[PDB]
From a paper:
Here we demonstrate that broadly neutralizing antibodies can be isolated from peripheral blood mononuclear cells of convalescent patients using [name]-[name]-2 receptor binding domains carrying epitope-specific mutations. This is exemplified by two human antibodies, GAR05, binding to epitope class 1, and [name], binding to a new epitope class 6 (located between class 3 and 5). Most of the neutralizing antibodies bind the spike receptor binding domain (RBD), and in particular class 1 and 2 epitopes within the receptor binding motif (RBM), directly blocking interaction with the human angiotensin converting enzyme receptor 2 (ACE2).
Residue numbers in the entry:
A (entry chain L): 1 to 211
B (entry chain H): 1 to 136, 145 to 223
C (entry chain R): 334 to 529
């Protein structure tokens, strides 16, 4: 098959900037290449095809270039509507897409307010225990959370969820939920979530001791 | 104007069958190769099938080859996607897409898209959410756990408090049920004065649960 | 005003020969010697004219028809030819005045896996007249079974896909073609060579 690899996977820019996202093809695909834009939960929109042809009714700030293996999409003077995920696509051998490049709003660096929530008594009657670590209104999006029950490791028991970039402050928020059985939950006392993120000099761990 | 109107879809048991429709107007139906593209929850785009303007050439992606069928009804200007032996990895929004000029036989590019159709492949049965307090500038919230199918709509104090509220993307757990949280960071001091109620609604099960979060 | 032959010769996409494109060039100056040497042309055959002599004439209109055919069919793009292309897709008149220009476009128009979107008409009730076109994609019903727009038994799609792959021998690789024709009428437009 022909694989498409886009680069970078995420890009941060401001209104007015000029952006350049790249798409590399495992083999030469000549001019058989197109770019699309997708907002979350909406149909993609075609922007460029045949490497360099502008689709009808697409703003001219969008241009495409490349022939063979290395392709480039260029937005000259960015605008709000342009913040989106972008996919390239080849049609030289069947039809495959690239993984996509997310284009996000650049804002000033902010640290997350890290909150920890023990499982409620109501749920502990259910037989399971959901402990929730919350990180609120941080930027950039990258942040690492890890749980330690009695300073252990916790693996495969946590799941995270991240909002999209707010429109007000342009930050992100994230939840990490740790689901354990009431037996294991009642079998230790030191529950902590440790967060590292660029707005923090040193990682902030938030914790409690059950009971 | 070119329009692609999609019909069908919804929840289907694993191994089941389902057929999707795409009703075309505003262009010459036989002048363009037609395609389906899907997007699995939180992933990018996957081409699955195509058919030529004349109906005489069909092209399949291997992940659906042998299970999915694409077909044409010219009098209705409609594209059908017949899906058999459905697996869970087939859960996705399915897009109908029209190709461009000089693309009579092969789809090259996708110049017009349908609005998308959720196909959910799961053995789970409909269930209303359990709601648990996330008790506490401070933060508090509401854990919305073990519901199916999506969606659930949360609001705080009947939609009055919308400042500083983040309701997270739901996660589908190993049980096949969904889970999500809705948080609110409120200026403290109100921790002892204001009274915070969260408002969970799940229409597929006609369940309405309002839970009071307090210190 | 320089004639926009770049838009013709260098178009990213080219028409299918069955749906051959025509562009009218007017109100401009063109150097046809420069055009002759602008690229490597596998053929460049003129009738009634020549590049060097075009550079000294003015015409009312120049039409540039363009399309893709396979290598061994370029020779059907000539006055008085026969075959599938000349009969059913693109027909020059016996008294043609202009130039036929072609070059190998394997790198641009083939696909690893085949390009079936370049087509030619395989049959037609009667031959094209000169510069006539036939763009119908209608299925031909050969029996009583209705086709409802679908190929099948007794239901013949009249367009054949070339299916261009880079591995093809030279004669089956795609060629882009531009046919320049030259017209003098009692009209106000003028398309002139540099010394006309
Ligand atoms: C068709 O294009 C060629 C090439 O043009 C250059 O290469 C392309 C890939 C694209 O990037 C163009 O924008 C480039 O300008 C033309 O050949 C050039 O002609 C100019 C004079 O007009 C000459 O100075 C250059 O050296 C030529 N370069 C090459 C590589 O041949 C050609 O003239 C165009 N055809 C017509 C009919 O205009």
């Amino acid at each position: 098959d022909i694989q498409m690899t886009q680069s970078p996977s995420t890009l941060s820019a401001s209104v007015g900037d000029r952006v350049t996202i790249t798409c590399r093809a495992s083999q030469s695909i000549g001019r058989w290449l197109a770019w699309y834009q997708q907002k979350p939960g909406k149909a993609p929109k075609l922007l460029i095809y045949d490497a360099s042809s502008l689709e009808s009714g697409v703003p001219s700030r969008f241009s495409g270039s490349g022939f063979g293996t290395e392709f480039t999409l260029t937005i000259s003077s960015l605008q709000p509507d342009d913040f989106a995920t972008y996919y390239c696509q080849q049609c030289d051998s069947l039809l495959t897409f690239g993984g996509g490049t997310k284009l996000e709003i650049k804002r000033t660096v902010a640290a997350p307010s890290v909150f920890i929530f023990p499982p409620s008594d109501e749920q502990l009657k259910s037989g399971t225990a959901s402990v929730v670590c919350l990180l609120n209104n941080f930027y950039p999006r990258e942040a690492k959370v890890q749980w330690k029950v009695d300073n252990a490791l916790q693996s495969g028991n946590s799941q995270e969820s991240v909002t999209e970039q707010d429109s007000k402050d342009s930050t992100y928020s994230l939840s990490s939920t740790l689901t354990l059985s009431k037996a294991d939950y009642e079998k230790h006392k030191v529950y902590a979530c440790e967060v590292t993120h660029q707005g923090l000099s040193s990682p902030v761990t938030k914790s409690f001791n059950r009971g | 104007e070119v329009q692609l109107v999609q019909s069908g879809g919804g929840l289907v048991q694993p191994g089941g069958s389902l057929r999707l429709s795409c009703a075309a107007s505003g262009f010459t139906f036989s002048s363009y190769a037609m395609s389906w593209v899907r997007q699995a929850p939180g992933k990018g785009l996957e081409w699955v099938l195509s058919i030529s303007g004349s109906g005489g050439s069909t092209y399949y992606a291997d992940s659906v080859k042998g299970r999915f069928t694409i077909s044409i009804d010219n009098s209705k200007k409609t594209v059908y996607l017949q899906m058999n032996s459905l697996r869970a990895e087939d859960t996705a929004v399915y897009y109908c897409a029209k190709s461009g000029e000089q693309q009579l036989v092969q789809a090259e590019y996708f110049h017009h898209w349908g609005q998308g159709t959720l196909v959910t492949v799961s053995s789970a049965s409909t269930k209303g959410p359990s709601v648990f307090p996330l008790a506490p500038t401070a933060a508090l919230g509401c854990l919305v756990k073990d519901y199916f199918p999506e969606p659930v709509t949360v609001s705080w104090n009947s939609g009055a408090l919308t400042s500083g509220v983040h309701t997270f993307p739901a996660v589908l757990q190993s049980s096949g049920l969904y889970s999500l949280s809705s948080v609110v960071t409120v200026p403290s001091s109100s921790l002892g004065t204001q009274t915070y109620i969260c408002n969970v609604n799940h229409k597929p099960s006609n369940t309405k649960v309002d839970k009071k979060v307090e210190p | 005003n320089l004639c926009p032959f770049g838009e013709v010769f260098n178009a990213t996409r080219f028409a299918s020969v069955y749906a051959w494109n025509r562009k009218r060039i007017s109100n401009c100056v063109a150097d046809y010697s420069v055009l002759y040497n602008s690229a490597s042309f596998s053929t460049f055959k003129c009738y009634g004219v020549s590049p060097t002599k075009l550079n000294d004439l003015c015409f009312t209109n120049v039409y540039a028809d363009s399309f893709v055919i396979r290598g061994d069919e370029v020779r059907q793009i000539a006055p008085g030819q026969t075959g599938k292309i000349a009969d059913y897709n693109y027909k020059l008149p016996d008294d043609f005045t202009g130039c036929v220009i072609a070059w190998n476009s394997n790198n641009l128009d083939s696909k690893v896996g085949g390009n079936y979107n370049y087509l030619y008409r395989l049959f037609r009730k009667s031959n094209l007249k000169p510069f006539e076109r036939d763009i119908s994609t209608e299925i031909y019903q050969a029996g009583s079974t209705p086709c409802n727009g679908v190929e099948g038994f007794n239901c013949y799609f009249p367009l054949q896909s070339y299916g261009f792959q880079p591995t093809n021998g030279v004669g089956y690789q795609p060629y882009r073609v531009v046919v320049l024709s030259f017209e003098l009428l009692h009209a106000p437009a003028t398309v002139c060579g540099p010394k006309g």
